[PDB]
PDB file of C-alpha atoms in Angstrom:
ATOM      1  CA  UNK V 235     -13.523   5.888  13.299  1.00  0.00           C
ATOM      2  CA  UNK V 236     -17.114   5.582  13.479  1.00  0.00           C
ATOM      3  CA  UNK V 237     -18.427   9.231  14.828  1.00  0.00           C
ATOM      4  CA  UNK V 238     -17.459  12.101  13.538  1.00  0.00           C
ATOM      5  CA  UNK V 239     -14.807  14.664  14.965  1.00  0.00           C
ATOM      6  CA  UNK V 240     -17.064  17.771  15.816  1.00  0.00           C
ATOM      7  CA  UNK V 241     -14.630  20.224  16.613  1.00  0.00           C
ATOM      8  CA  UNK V 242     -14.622  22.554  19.836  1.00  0.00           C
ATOM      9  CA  UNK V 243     -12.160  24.919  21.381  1.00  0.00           C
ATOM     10  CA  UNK V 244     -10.134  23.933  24.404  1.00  0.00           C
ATOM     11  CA  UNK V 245     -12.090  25.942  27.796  1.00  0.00           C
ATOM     12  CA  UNK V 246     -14.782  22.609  26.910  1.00  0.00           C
ATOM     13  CA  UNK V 247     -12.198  20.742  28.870  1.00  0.00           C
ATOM     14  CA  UNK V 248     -11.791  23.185  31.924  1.00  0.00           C
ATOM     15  CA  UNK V 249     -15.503  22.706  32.735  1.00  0.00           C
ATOM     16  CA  UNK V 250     -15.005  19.315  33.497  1.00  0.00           C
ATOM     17  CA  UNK V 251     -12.139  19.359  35.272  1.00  0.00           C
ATOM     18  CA  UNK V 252     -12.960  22.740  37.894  1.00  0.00           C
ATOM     19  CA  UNK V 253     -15.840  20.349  38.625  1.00  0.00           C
ATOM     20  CA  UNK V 254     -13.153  18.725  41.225  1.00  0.00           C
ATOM     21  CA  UNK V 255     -11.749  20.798  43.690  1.00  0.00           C
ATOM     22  CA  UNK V 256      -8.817  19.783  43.396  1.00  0.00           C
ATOM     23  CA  UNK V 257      -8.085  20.769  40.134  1.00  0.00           C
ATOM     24  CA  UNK V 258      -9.136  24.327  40.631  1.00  0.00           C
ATOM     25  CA  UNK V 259      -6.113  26.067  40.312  1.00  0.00           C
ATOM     26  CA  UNK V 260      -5.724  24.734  36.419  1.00  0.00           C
ATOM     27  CA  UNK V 261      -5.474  27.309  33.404  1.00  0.00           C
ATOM     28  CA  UNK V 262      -5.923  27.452  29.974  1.00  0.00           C
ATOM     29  CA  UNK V 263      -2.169  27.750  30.106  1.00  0.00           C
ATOM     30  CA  UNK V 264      -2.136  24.513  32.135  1.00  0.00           C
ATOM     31  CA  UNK V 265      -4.886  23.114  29.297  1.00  0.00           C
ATOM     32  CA  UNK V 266      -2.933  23.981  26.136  1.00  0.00           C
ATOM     33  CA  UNK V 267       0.390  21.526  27.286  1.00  0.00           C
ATOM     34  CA  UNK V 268      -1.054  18.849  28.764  1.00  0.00           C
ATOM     35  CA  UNK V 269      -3.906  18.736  25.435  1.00  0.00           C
ATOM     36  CA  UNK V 270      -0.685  18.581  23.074  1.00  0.00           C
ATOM     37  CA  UNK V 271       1.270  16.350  25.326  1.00  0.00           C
ATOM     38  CA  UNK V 272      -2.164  14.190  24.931  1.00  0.00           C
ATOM     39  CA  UNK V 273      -2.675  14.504  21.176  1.00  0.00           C
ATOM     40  CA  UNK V 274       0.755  13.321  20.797  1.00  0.00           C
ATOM     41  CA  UNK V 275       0.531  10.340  23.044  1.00  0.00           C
ATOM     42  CA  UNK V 276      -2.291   9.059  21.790  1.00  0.00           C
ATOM     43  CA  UNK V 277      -1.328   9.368  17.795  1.00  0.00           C
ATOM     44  CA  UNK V 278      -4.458   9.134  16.566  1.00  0.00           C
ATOM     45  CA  UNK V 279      -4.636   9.939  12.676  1.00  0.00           C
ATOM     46  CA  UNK V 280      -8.010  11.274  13.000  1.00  0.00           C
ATOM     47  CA  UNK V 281      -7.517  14.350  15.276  1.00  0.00           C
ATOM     48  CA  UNK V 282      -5.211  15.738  12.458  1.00  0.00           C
ATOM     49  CA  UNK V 283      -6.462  18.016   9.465  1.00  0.00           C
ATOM     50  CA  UNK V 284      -5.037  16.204   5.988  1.00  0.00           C
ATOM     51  CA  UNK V 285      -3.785  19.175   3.565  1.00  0.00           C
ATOM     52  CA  UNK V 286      -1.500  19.008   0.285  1.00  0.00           C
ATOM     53  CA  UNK V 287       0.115  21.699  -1.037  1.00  0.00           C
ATOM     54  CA  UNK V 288       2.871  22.004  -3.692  1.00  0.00           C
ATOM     55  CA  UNK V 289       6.287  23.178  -2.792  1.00  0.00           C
ATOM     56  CA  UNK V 290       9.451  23.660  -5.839  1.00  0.00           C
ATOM     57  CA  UNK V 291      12.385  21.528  -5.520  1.00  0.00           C
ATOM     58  CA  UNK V 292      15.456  24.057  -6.469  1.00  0.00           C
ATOM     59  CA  UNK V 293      18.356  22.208  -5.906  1.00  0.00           C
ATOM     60  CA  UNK V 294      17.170  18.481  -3.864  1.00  0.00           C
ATOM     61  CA  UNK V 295      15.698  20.926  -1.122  1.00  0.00           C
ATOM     62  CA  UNK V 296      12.386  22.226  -0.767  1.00  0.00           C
ATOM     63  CA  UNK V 297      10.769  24.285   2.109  1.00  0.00           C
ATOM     64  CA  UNK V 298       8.226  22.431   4.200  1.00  0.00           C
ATOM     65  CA  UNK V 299       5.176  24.222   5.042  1.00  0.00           C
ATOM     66  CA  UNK V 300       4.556  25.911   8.604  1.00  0.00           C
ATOM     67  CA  UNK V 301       2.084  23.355   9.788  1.00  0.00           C
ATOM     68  CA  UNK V 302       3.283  20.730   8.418  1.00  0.00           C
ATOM     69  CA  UNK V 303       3.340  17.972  11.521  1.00  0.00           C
ATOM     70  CA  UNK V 304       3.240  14.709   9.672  1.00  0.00           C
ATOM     71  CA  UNK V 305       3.995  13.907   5.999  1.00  0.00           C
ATOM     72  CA  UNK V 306       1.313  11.518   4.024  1.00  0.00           C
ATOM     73  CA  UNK V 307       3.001  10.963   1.109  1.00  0.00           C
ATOM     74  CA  UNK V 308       5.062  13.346  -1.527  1.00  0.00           C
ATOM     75  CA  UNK V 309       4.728  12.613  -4.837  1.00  0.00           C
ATOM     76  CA  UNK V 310       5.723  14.901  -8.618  1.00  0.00           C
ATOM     77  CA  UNK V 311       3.725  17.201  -9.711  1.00  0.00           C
ATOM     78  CA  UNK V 312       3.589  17.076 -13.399  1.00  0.00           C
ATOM     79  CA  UNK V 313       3.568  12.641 -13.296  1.00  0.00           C
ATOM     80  CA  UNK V 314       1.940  12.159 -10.073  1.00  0.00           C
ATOM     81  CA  UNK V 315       4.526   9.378  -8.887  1.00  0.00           C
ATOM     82  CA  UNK V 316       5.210   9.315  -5.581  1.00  0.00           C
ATOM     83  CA  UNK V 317       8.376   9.210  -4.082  1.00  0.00           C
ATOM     84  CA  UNK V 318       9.107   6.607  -1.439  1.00  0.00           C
ATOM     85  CA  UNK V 319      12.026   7.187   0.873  1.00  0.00           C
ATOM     86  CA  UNK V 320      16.105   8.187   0.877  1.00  0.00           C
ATOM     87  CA  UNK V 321      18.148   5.506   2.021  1.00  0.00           C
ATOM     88  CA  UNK V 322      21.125   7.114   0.011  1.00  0.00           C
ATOM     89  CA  UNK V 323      23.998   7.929   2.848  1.00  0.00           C
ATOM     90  CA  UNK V 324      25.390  10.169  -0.493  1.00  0.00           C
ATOM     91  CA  UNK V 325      22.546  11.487  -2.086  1.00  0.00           C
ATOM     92  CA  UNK V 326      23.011  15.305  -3.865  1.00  0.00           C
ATOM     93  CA  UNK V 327      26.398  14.767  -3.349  1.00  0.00           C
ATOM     94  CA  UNK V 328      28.482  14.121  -6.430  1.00  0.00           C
ATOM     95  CA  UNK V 329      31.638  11.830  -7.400  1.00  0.00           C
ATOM     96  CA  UNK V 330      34.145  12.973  -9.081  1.00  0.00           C
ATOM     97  CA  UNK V 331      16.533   5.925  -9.953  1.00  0.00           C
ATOM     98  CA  UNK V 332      13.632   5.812  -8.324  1.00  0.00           C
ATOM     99  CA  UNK V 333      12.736   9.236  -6.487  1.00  0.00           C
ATOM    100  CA  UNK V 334      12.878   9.804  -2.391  1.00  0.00           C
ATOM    101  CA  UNK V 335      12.505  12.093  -0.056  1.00  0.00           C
ATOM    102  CA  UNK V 336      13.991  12.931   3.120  1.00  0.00           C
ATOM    103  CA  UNK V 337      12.612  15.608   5.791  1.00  0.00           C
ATOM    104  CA  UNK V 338      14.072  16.599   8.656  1.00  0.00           C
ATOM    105  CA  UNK V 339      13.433  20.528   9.932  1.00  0.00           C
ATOM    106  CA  UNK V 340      11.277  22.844   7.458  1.00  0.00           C
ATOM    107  CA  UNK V 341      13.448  21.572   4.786  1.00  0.00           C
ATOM    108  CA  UNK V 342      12.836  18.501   2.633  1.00  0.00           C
ATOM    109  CA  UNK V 343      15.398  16.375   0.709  1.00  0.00           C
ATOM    110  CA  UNK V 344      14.451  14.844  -2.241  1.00  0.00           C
ATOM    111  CA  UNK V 345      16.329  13.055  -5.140  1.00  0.00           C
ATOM    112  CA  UNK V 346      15.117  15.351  -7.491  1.00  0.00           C
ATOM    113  CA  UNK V 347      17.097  18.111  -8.510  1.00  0.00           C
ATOM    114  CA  UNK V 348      13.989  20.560 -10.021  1.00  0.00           C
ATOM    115  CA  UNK V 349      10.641  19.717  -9.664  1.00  0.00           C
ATOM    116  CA  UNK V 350       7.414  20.575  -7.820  1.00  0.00           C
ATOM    117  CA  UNK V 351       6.258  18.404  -5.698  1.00  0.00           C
ATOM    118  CA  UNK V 352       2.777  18.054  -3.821  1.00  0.00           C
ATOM    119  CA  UNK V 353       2.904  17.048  -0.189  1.00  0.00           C
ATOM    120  CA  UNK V 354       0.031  15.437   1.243  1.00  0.00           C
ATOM    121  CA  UNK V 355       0.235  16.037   5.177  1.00  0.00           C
ATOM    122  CA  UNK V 356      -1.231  16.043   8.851  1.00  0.00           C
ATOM    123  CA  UNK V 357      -1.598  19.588  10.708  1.00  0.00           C
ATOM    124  CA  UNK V 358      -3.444  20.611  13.786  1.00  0.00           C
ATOM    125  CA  UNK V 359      -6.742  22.029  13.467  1.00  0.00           C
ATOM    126  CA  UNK V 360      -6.820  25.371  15.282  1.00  0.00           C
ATOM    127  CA  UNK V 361      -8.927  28.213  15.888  1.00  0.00           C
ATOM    128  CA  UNK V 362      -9.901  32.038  15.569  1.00  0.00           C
ATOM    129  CA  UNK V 363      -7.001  32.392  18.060  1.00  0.00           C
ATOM    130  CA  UNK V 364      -3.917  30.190  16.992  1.00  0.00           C
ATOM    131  CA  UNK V 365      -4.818  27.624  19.480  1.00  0.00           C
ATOM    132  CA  UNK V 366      -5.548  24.253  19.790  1.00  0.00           C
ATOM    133  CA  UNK V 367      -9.212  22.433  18.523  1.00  0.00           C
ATOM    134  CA  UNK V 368     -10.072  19.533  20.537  1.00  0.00           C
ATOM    135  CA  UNK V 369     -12.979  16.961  19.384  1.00  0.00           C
ATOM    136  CA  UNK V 370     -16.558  16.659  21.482  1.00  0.00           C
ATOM    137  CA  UNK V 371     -16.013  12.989  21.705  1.00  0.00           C
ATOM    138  CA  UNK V 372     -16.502  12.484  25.367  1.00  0.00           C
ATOM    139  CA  UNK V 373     -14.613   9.676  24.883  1.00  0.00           C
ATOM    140  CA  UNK V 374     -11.681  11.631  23.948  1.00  0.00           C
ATOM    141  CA  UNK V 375     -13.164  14.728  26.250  1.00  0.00           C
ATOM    142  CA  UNK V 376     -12.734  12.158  29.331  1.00  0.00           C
ATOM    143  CA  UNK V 377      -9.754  10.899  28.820  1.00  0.00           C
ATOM    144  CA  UNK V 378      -7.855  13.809  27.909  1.00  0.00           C
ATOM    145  CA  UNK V 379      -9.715  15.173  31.556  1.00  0.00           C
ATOM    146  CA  UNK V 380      -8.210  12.241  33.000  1.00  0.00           C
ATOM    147  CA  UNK V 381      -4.993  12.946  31.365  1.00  0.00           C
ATOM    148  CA  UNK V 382      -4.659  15.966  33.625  1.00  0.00           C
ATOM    149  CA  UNK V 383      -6.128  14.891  36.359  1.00  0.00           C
ATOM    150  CA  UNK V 384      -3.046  12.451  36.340  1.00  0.00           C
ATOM    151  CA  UNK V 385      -0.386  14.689  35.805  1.00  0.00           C
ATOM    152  CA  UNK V 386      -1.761  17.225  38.093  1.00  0.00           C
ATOM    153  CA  UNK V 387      -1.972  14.537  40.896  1.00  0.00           C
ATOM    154  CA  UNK V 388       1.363  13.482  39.843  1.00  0.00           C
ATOM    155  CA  UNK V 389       2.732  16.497  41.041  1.00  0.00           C
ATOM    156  CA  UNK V 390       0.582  16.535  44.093  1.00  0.00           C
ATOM    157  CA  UNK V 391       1.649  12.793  45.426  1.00  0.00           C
ATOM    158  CA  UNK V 392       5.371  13.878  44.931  1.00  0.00           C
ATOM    159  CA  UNK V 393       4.285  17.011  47.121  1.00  0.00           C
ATOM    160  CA  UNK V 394       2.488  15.176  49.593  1.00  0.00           C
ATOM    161  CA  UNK V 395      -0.287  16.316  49.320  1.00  0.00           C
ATOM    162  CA  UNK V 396      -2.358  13.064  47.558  1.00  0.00           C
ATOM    163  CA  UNK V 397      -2.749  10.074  49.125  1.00  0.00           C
ATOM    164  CA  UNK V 398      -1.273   6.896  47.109  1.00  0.00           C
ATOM    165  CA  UNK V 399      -4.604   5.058  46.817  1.00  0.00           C
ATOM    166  CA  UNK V 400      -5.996   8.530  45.031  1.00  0.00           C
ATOM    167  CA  UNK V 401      -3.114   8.661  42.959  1.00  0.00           C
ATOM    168  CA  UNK V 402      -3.712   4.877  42.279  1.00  0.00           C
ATOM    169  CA  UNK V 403      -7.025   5.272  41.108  1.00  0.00           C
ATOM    170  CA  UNK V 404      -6.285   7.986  38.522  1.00  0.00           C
ATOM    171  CA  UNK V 405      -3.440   5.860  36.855  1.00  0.00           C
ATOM    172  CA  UNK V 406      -5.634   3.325  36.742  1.00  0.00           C
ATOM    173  CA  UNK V 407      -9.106   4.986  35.317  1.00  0.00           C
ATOM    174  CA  UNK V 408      -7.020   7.050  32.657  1.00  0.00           C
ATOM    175  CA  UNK V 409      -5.422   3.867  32.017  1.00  0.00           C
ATOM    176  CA  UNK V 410      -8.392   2.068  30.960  1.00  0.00           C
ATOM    177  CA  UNK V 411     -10.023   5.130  29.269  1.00  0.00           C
ATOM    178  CA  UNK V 412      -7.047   5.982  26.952  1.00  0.00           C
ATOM    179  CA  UNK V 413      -7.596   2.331  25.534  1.00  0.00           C
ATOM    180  CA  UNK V 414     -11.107   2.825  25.093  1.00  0.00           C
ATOM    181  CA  UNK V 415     -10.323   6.340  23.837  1.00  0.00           C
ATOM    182  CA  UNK V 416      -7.412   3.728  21.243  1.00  0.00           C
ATOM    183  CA  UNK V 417     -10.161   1.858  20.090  1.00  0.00           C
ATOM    184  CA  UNK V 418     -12.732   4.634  19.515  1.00  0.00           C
ATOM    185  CA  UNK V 419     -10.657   6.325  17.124  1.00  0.00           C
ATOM    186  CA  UNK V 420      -8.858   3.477  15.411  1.00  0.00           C
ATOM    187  CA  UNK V 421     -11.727   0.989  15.103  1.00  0.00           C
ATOM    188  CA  UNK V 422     -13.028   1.448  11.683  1.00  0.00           C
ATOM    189  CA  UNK V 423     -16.547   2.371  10.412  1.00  0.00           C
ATOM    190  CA  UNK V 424     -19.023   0.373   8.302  1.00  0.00           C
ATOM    191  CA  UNK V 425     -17.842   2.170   5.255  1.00  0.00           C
ATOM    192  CA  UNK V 426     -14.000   1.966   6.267  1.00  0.00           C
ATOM    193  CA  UNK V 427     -14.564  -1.926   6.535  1.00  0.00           C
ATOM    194  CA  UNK V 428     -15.570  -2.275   3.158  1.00  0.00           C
ATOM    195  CA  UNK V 429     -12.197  -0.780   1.660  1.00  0.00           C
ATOM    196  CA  UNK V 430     -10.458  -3.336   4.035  1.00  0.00           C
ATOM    197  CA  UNK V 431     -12.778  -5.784   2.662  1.00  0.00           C
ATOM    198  CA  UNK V 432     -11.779  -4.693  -0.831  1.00  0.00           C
ATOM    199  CA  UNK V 433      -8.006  -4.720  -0.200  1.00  0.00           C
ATOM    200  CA  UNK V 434      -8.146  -7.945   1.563  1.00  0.00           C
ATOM    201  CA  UNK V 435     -10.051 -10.210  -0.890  1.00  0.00           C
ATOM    202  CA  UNK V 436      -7.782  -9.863  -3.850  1.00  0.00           C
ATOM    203  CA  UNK V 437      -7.806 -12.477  -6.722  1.00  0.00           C
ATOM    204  CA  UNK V 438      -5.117 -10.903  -8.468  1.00  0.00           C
ATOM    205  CA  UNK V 439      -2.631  -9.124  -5.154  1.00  0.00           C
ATOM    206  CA  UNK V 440      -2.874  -5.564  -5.658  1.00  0.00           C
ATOM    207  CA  UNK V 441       0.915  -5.033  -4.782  1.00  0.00           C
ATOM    208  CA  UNK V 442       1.521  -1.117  -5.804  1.00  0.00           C
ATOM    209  CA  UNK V 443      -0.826   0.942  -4.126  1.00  0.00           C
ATOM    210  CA  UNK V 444       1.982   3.240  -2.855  1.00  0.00           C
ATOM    211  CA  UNK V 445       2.995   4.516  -6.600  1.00  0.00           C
ATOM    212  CA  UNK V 446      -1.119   6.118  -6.332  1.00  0.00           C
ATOM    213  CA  UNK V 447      -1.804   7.933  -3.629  1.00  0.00           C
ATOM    214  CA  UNK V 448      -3.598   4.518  -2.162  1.00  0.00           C
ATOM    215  CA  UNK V 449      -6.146   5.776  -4.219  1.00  0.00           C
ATOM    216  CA  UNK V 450      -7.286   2.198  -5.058  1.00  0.00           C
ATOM    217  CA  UNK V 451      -6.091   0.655  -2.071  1.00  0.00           C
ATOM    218  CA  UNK V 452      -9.818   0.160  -1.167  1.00  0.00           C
ATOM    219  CA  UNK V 453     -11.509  -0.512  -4.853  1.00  0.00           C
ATOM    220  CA  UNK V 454     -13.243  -4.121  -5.567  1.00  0.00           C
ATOM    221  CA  UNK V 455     -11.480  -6.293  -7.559  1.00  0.00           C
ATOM    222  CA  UNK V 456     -13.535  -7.668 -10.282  1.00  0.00           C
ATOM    223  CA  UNK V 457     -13.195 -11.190 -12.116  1.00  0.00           C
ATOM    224  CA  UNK V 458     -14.810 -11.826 -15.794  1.00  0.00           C
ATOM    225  CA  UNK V 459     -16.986 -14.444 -15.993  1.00  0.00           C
ATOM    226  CA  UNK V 460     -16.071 -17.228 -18.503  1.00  0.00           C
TER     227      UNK V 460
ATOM    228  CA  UNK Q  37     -25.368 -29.451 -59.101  1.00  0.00           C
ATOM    229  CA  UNK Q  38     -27.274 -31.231 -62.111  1.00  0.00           C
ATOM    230  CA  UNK Q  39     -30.478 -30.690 -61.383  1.00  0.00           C
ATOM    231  CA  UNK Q  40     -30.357 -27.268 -59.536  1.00  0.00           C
ATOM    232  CA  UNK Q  41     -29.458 -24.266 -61.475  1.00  0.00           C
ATOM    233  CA  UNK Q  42     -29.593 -22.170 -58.485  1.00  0.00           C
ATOM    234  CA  UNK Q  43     -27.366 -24.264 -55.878  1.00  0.00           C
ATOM    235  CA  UNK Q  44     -23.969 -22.666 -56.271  1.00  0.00           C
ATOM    236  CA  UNK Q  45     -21.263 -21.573 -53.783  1.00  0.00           C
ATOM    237  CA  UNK Q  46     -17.624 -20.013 -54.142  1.00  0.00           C
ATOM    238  CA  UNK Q  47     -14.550 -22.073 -53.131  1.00  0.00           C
ATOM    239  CA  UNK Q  48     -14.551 -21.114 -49.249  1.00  0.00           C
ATOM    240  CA  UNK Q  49     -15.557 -24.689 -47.362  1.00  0.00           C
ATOM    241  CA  UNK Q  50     -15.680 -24.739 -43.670  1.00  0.00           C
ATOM    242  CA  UNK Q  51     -17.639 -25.327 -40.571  1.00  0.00           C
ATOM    243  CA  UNK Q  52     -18.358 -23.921 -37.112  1.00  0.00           C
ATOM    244  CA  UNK Q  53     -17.866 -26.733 -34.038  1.00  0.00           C
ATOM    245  CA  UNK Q  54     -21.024 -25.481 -32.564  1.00  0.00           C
ATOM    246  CA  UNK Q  55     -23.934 -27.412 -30.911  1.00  0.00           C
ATOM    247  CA  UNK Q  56     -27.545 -26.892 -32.121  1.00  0.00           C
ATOM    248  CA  UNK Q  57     -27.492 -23.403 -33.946  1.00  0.00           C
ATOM    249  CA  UNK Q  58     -25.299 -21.960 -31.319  1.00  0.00           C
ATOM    250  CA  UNK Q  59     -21.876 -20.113 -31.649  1.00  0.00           C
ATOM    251  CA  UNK Q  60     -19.143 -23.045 -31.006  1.00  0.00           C
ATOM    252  CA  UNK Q  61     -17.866 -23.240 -27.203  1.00  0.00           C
ATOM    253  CA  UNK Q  62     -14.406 -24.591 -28.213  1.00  0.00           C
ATOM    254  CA  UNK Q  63     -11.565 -26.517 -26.442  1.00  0.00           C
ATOM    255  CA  UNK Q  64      -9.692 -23.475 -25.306  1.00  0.00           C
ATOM    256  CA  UNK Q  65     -13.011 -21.477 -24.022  1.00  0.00           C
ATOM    257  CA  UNK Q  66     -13.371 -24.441 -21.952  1.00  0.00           C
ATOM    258  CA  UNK Q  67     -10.323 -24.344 -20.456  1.00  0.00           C
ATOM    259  CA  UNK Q  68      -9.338 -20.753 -20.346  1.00  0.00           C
ATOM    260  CA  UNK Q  69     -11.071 -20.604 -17.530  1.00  0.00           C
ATOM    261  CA  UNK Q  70      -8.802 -22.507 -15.156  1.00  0.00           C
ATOM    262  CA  UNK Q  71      -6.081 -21.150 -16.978  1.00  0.00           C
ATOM    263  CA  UNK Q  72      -6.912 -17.701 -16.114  1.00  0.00           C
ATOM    264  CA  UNK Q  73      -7.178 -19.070 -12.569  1.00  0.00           C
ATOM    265  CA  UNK Q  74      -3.981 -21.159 -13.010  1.00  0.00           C
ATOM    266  CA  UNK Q  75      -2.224 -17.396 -13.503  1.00  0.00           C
ATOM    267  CA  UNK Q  76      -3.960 -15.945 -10.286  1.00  0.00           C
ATOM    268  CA  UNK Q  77      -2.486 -18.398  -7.383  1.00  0.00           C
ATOM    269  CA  UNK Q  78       0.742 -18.853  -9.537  1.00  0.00           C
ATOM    270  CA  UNK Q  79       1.164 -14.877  -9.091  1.00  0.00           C
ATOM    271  CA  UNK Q  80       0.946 -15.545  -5.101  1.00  0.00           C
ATOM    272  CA  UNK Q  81       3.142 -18.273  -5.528  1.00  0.00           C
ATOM    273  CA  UNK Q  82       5.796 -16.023  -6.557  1.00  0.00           C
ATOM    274  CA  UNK Q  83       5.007 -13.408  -3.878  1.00  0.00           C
ATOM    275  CA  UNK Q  84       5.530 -15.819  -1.683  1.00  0.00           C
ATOM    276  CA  UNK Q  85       8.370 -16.935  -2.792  1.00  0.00           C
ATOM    277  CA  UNK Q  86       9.768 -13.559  -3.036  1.00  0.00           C
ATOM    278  CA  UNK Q  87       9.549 -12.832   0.167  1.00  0.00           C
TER     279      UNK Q  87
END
């Protein structure tokens, strides 16, 4: 992403859309759904706050933070090596390698009996109330008002009460917006093109950047001169 | 030497493959090059052949 994600609370959007008639019966109730339906349509990486915390393995389980939306990576604590994925249809399970992990609810499943483990993971940024925290981009400000707009017309054309070419317009302006909005967020910066430039001009193929936390996914491979 | 009293040496006779005063760029410096470079597409040769 190339601009930075200035944070600000939801009611930003509700100006923009009680600017159409139309849409003046819409709430902040109304605002919260169709923001997280959004969010999650969209799947941008960069609307999400990246934490880690360490959780203790006690017997191949571990509790999962509250927050916790999307997992980055787990890894050990004392060694640092992270743990890739279970495959295992048998795994703590006993008859009569390398480390996974396996999260379904709050609870993760690892391979490891126990062990700490740090979790490197996606939340939602929220606010002095417990409610979402939306960026300024109007990029993303637009398009999340044209979200709305489209599910609140939606409702209206099955009413009656919107005309199809209306109804037509608004799928197809939020249709083009949420690609720009893709792009916006996706498209990487000056200094997030060098790190691709770094990974992708590799003498000797960097093949293991998983076991670090990608740490020197992005680092400049350098040749001796002889 | 018979008519030097001071030209002496010990037993150790050798000499450095050098050019004009210089330390000696030998065979394998010359080629250690391409050998090093030799090792680098080899090593996607056998990525590629891994997968």
């Amino acid at each position: 992403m190339v601009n930075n994600i200035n944070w600000v609370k939801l009611p930003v959007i509700l100006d923009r859309l009680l600017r159409h008639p139309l849409l003046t019966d819409l709430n902040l109730e109304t605002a919260i759904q169709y923001t997280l339906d959004f969010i999650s349509a969209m799947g941008l990486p960069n609307v999400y706050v990246d934490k880690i915390e360490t959780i203790d393995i006690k017997e191949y389980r571990g509790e999962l933070p509250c927050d916790l939306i999307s997992i980055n990576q787990v890894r050990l604590h004392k060694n640092g090596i992270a743990l890739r994925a279970m495959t295992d249809n048998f795994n703590a399970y006993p008859t009569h390698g390398e480390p996974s992990f396996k999260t379904q609810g709050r609870v993760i499943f690892t391979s490891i009996k126990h062990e700490k483990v740090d979790i490197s993971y996606k939340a939602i940024m929220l606010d002095d109330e417990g409610l979402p925290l939306i960026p300024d981009n109007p990029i993303f400000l637009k398009t999340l008002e044209l979200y709305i707009k489209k599910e609140w017309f939606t409702i209206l054309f099955d009413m009656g009460k919107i005309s199809p070419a209306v109804l037509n317009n608004t799928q197809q302006e939020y249709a083009f917006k949420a690609g720009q909005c893709n792009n916006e967020f996706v498209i990487p910066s000056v200094s997030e093109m060098e790190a691709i430039t770094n990974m992708w001009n590799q003498l000797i193929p960097r093949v293991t950047e998983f076991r670090r936390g990608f740490k020197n996914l992005g680092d400049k491979e350098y040749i001796r001169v002889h | 030497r018979l008519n030097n009293p001071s030209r002496c040496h010990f037993g150790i006779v050798g000499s450095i493959y050098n050019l004009n005063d210089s330390r000696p760029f030998s065979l394998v410096d010359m080629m250690k090059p391409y050998n090093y470079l030799y090792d680098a597409i080899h090593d996607r040769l056998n990525k590629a052949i891994a997968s």
